[PDB]
């Protein structure tokens, strides 16, 4: 059970993959603002044409810059000694 439907939000910036033969060299471009939305296709700005939603990908916001190498205290064979282990960012 897989309904032929891609939920593309109208107003969202989406990368439109160049419709032709299946080669990795024809890639997507934009990203373009979705103007129109149908169950299987969508029309966007800039390209001025209807695109099939299988050939389209929704763009990323940006990310989350969060990094710090830090020390973690494990219980060791100790009187009052500690074992500090460098954790990932």
């Amino acid at each position: 059970h897989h309904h032929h439907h891609h939920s593309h939000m109208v107003g969202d910036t989406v990368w439109v993959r160049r419709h032709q033969t299946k080669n990795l060299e024809p890639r997507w471009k934009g990203p373009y603002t979705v103007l129109l939305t149908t169950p299987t296709a969508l029309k966007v700005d800039g390209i001025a044409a209807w695109i099939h939603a299988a050939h389209v990908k929704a763009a990323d916001p940006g990310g989350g810059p969060s990094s710090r190498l830090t020390w973690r205290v494990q219980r060791s064979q100790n009187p009052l000694k500690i074992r500090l282990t460098r954790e990932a960012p």
Binding site: W71, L80, K81, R83, R86
Partner: protein, 96 residues
């Protein structure tokens, strides 16, 4: 035109040695090693950052042999470096 006065008057510093300390500095109790012990390891990678900073700045270890882990052995660590690191973290927190 706006006039407001500041005020700072008086300044004096009076300090000398703690003890004779004819040695390097080993007047530390086991309780002193215990106090800096919990105070460091209970606090996050900020104070764990300061403890590994000082021990590796005087005597490096992890960078040569497994940089992903370090063990700070207070009970067999030099009492100079202990008492130094102790007063450092104490003045770093200023909490009572």
């Amino acid at each position: 035109h706006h006039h407001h006065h500041h005020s700072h008057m008086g300044k004096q510093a009076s300090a000398s040695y703690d003890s004779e300390e004819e040695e390097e500095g080993l007047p530390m109790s086991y309780d002193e090693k215990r106090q800096l012990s919990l105070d460091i390891n209970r606090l996050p990678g900020e104070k764990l950052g300061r403890v590994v900073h000082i021990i590796q700045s005087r005597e490096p270890s992890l960078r040569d042999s497994n940089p992903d882990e370090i063990e700070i052995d207070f009970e067999t660590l030099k009492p100079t470096t202990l008492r130094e690191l102790e007063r450092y973290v104490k003045s770093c927190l200023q909490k009572k």
